[PDB]
Amino acid sequence: MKQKVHSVSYLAKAEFEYKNGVYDLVALPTGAEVIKISLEVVGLPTAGHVSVGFKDESKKNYSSILTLPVNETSGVVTKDYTVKSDKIVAAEVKDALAEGSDGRPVKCVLRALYFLPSVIEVEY
């Protein structure tokens, strides 16, 4: 029994304030082993969607991987990802107005747990 495993893991946490726009949340290296993406809505939104996905450092390669309507206020991507030139995790809010029902601004927190491309050899 012998294998190569990723021994280095990072967590990136980034906040944005949940109104229309595009935000570049997490930067990933080539060969990164993205194993968890979680999005959370802190507050009480009244209308809008948040779409998180992957895009290039420069060019317009955005593609949503997780969509969150107002109601559930939390989500996790159902899929695991190896970074292949799509080195930006990004989130866009197309519909959103002011906070709503609270008076206090609505937050969105994205946490990305990913393993670095480096590998080491271990036998058990």
Binding site: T30, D56, E57, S58, K59, S85, K87
Partner: protein, 48 residues
């Protein structure tokens, strides 16, 4: 040619260095640009 040495510098591949071409991905090319020295980014695919 016209007093100007013409040099075959090779092909930029994933292994060794040569002149680029439109097969190099935008990320792979841009990794070698300082972004603080360049005025603008035009990659070989963008030039193509």
């Amino acid at each position: 040619i016209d007093n100007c040495p013409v040099i075959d510098a090779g092909v930029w591949n994933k292994l060794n260095v040569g002149m680029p071409n439109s097969s190099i991905s935008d990320s792979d090319f841009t990794r070698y640009l300082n972004k603080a020295n360049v005025s603008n980014i035009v990659t070989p695919m963008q030039l193509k």
